Amino acid sequence: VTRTAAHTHIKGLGLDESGVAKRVEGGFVGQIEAREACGVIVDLIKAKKMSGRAILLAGGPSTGKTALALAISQELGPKVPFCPLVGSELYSVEVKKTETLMENFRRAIGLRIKETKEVYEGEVTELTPEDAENPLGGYGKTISHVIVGLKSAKGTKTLRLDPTIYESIQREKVSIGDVIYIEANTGAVKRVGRSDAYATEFDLETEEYVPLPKGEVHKKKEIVQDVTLHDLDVANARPQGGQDVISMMGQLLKPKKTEITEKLRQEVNKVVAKYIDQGVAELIPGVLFIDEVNMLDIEIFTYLNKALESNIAPVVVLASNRGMTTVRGTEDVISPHGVPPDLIDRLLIVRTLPYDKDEIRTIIERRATVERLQVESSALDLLATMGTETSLRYALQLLAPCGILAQTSNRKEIVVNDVNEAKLLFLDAKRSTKILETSANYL
Amino acid sequence: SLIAAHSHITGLGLDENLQPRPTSEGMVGQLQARRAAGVILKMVQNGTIAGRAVLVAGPPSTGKTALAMGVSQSLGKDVPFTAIAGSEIFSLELSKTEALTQAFRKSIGIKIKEETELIEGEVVEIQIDRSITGGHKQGKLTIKTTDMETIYELGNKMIDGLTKEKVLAGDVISIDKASGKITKLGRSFARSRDYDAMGADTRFVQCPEGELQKRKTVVHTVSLHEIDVINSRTQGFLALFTGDTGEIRSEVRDQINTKVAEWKEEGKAEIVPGVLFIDEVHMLDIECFSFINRALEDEFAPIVMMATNRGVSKTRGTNYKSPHGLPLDLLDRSIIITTKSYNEQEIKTILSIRAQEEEVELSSDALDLLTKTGVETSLRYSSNLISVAQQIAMKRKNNTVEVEDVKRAYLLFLDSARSVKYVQENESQYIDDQGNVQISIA
Amino acid sequence: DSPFSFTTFGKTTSKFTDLIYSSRNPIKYSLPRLIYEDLILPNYNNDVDIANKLKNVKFNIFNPSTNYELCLFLSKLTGEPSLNEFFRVSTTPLLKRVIERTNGPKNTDSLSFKTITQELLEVTRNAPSEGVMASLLNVEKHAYEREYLNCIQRGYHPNVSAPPVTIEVLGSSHVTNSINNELFDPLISQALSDIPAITQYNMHVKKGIPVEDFPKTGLFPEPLNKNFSSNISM
Amino acid sequence: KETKEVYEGEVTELTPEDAENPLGGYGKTISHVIVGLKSAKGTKTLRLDPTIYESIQREKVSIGDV
């Protein structure tokens, strides 16, 4: 019916009105202090006033750090932009990691707009172009004007096209007996399709048929668009969409990431400021999540020390699982969680704590509930004592082989012999390391 | 085709209770590994869960890639199986994260259902109206069968279809509207007056009877990587084959995921999961492992099967030794299948299966001495000696490999330990680690 | 569902109605008159044109008036029957070399021969189907017609569409004519378009202009589908 | 391996024959193209498709060429 993969049983932080977290509610087990801190930062980003606030999630492996970030993402809802990222994604062959860092920094600031569109639409009735007096003069086009006759519901409009509009008319291959869509902001043209005012089954080009459009030919409609600052930056960096030569020649070239200068960013910020001062746009700060921040190296950390001091940067969440680890790119200094102390001084560390036996048992119980599986009480206790014995993740990923081995015996429940078969079939990390140590030829 | 290293395996050889037979589908032995592979095969065929990493570990020449390719063979058609080596990630065009994202997205499959209309009949009239420069091309077509008669309108791609492999008003053609395939079935008119311009020998067919237009529900399997390559830019179909797709942006993949979810909701498409196989995974940087660490936790992730013949060794990009060449984060979220070495009878049955695959007839004593050499030395040397002994066998003009051919092949071609001993007995002849060599024999 | 128009154009504050293209970029790069007059446009007090001649014509190494031996050497190398072709190659931009390329004849006594890959390409131009060379050379269109790609839908659209950044110079018309010529070059824009058929009939029959004197048109690459030809979704 | 059926030689005549019922609004409608060819110990006239004359005009084929 549905598909799940190591998540999606987490629906949110699951707090009260006063922020006090319950024991088990919303797919979460334990971690009350971390969940309350996550509720605090969720209220902080919903306050929509702060810029350049940073926390770090510290904990071991298999303790619930990325689950907290996904819970923050679902508690904020889909409207506030959330940018998941990995510390290895910053290394690009096309562009330096500094520009990738502000690439993802500007990708995490949202914006709405309320944009008016001047629309001419209808059914084309006639297509009569007129020619120039001397077309082979080298300068000037072959034609001068094109007359188009648009017919819609309760109205018929005749327009005199520019040649530049007629190029974007011709490129979508219009003809008499078609329905079009002139969009006057950019000159973009949509061929809606053949009208149903003519015959239907007499075609051979798998076309679809559209009725005559309602309303007048000339329209002014309001369209709500959600957008980021990064899309504005990359649209102004590689300008496509116009009706000039360069606009066509950019749509056919290979797209490549470029080092965006600060000057275009200041101009884009001034344009967004003049949009927000006229009461049209509203600014949506977001959340940037970097998992495995220890894989970042020293120059990215040094640039992030500048990037956090900007007046536009969003709330950034980091995560690591190293105790006493030297920074990548340096030779001798050791700092907590692989993060240098000058950036540690700007953080707000959140501890994550390990679990007990009953917490592992109820996590396995809710997991077997989510993947629609039925477990015996003795088999559940065996899974819980295995999860204390080896790891939570090894018991968490072992249950689908119990489901398969229970299915292949024409059975619905999971029994202890079935769990022992899954024990013997698949190994864990510790048994594999013991096999590697007592091995003949690097087995 | 050609007889390869794994050409003797068609499937896994499992019962309905997932009990592997001792000799079935080219597999002998390895009962527990084959049982676990059948479990993972039923898991992939179920398709409910995603993002689970499977490890196959053991010594060299044990059956890792043979088991993986047997899983691929039992997986069947319309399920993707991206089998890449570990060295392919290091590239000068794509980053390691981007290359691994493409390798992940190649193993998730989209099955789209489409509606088609099939037109077949005897053609009567074709009118083609082109401009002076040949750019604006429009036309009319008149198709007929024995009972009906229709006149259609032609488009540019249809006219370019009729222009190639030209139809001459009396051929019987086939047209798929949703595909744009023009298939000339033959010719039924049999025109007597033909000009001496073409050497056509078109077979006589009969003009089809009945309904001219018929509906057909068609299906096809596509994957996500070619979808976001197509949606990436204007000429994505060419970049699909040239491989010139450099670092597709995240909004493209986000909107493709949203469109795929919409297609699943509308019932137009359904997602068919596949398997990504990374052969010799120990040669990956720790950045690649840290990306896999998160990318295994997405819904749009396949079942990743990784094979390692390494013991405890140094992880690439770092300076500490780790089990299987992988950090403990990857071993935290992966279930490991362990393979074991073979015996006398298993090696003998492997050599019998390979000899029957290579159609080389072997005698009993030759098979015994080949098994003796494959027990003393490795299995692969005794596997590769078979064709050499066969070439020696037709060199003496008899189609049976006896003792003397395998003995001559043993003398002619050297082992690993034999080559090591022969080098170490004559170290002055070869260039050493310090680059000093004695060339003169005086 | 359309991309956001990052542009400012003439909008109405509401026997025909004429609509003129007036899309401009909201970002304006304001430039003074002094730089454009004293460094780009030549005058009596600068030496832009003299240096341009001295670098492009007088000291050009492909000049037949001064390097006739080199021109003969390259003519024997390439087998091209005009010695002034190297001068015309070296002194015009790339796209001007693209859009008026003519397949002229080259003499046999030369060294630029037919590459085996080029011969494999040239065999299968007008070859029809069920030929072995054509079928071995038409893999990509076979994959196009087998995977049903001509009826697929569009899933991705860009979020922002913007024109190029308009540079303004206050108090000069020459910059305006130069910018209008660069943005709307009639030769390139005619290469990226086509001529209407009734207009062509007025060229050829009613005016006597032959077919080979036409401006080159129709160099735009075709989109994959009819759905992929636009960014506006119904 | 492949089989090629070729016609080659010097052109002897090149006359596009008109149709017995020409269509209005057009000029020199062609029913067939007659080209004569000559070679070493061989001469033979041909009868061609009408669309071939367009390719003859594009390839600039005058009289006396091979």
């Binding site: 008499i176 007996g177 053949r194 003519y198 015959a199 239907t200 007499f202 | 009567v124 009239e125 074709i126 009118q127 083609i128 109206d129 082109r130 401009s131 002076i132 604006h136 429009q138 009319k140 309108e153 001459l168 008003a169 009396g170 008119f189 025109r191 007056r193 | 058929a197 009734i198 062509q200 009939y201 007025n202 050829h204 029959v205 | 149709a19 269509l23 057009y26 000029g27 020199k28 409608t29 062609i30 029913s31 067939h32 498709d49 009408p50 669309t51 004359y53 367009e54």
Partner: peptide, 28 residues
């Protein structure tokens, strides 16, 4: 009642007719 056909309008364009017995090429 039957629904009328789309208008076919081809002015100043070449024409190729392929009948059963003879072919045409109406050019300019």
């Amino acid at each position: 009642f039957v629904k009328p056909r789309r208008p076919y309008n081809s002015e100043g364009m070449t024409r190729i007719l392929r009948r059963y017995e003879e072919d045409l090429f109406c050019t300019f």
